Amino acid sequence: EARKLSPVELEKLVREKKRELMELRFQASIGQLSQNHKIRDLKRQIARLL
RNA sequence: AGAUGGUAAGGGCCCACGGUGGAUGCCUCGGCACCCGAGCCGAUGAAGGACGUGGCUACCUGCGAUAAGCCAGGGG
């Protein structure tokens, strides 16, 4: 769990973004919603040791 | 008595200009053949797909719920 509880947080954030997108209120789309390239797989990469 | 000339609804032929049409000419990221290199993939789940994934994405190419992409090395 050295990298978890962070993607739970960032997937919570992306289900603030996808809420904000459906109503007409998401005015930085690719500036925010394509976080999941570097962010979000920011800490979805470790070698599963042991 | 007397004759040729005429009338063009429309037709014919020719000339001029159009439309329809897609031939011809000229192109090539396309294809064919030949010669070279290369030559297997799969329980470490293949070939092939269905579905999906872009913020809006219909389709194609991707790519798999990490879903036009992730991480590291190398080239630029």
Ligand SMILES: [Mg+2]
């Ligand atoms: Mg003339």
Ligand SMILES: [Mg+2]
């Ligand atoms: Mg003509």
Ligand SMILES: [Mg+2]
């Ligand atoms: Mg024509």
Ligand SMILES: [Mg+2]
């Ligand atoms: Mg051949």
Ligand SMILES: [Mg+2]
């Ligand atoms: Mg396959």
Ligand SMILES: [Mg+2]
């Ligand atoms: Mg797809």
Ligand SMILES: [Mg+2]
């Ligand atoms: Mg998409």
Ligand SMILES: [Mg+2]
């Ligand atoms: Mg979408």
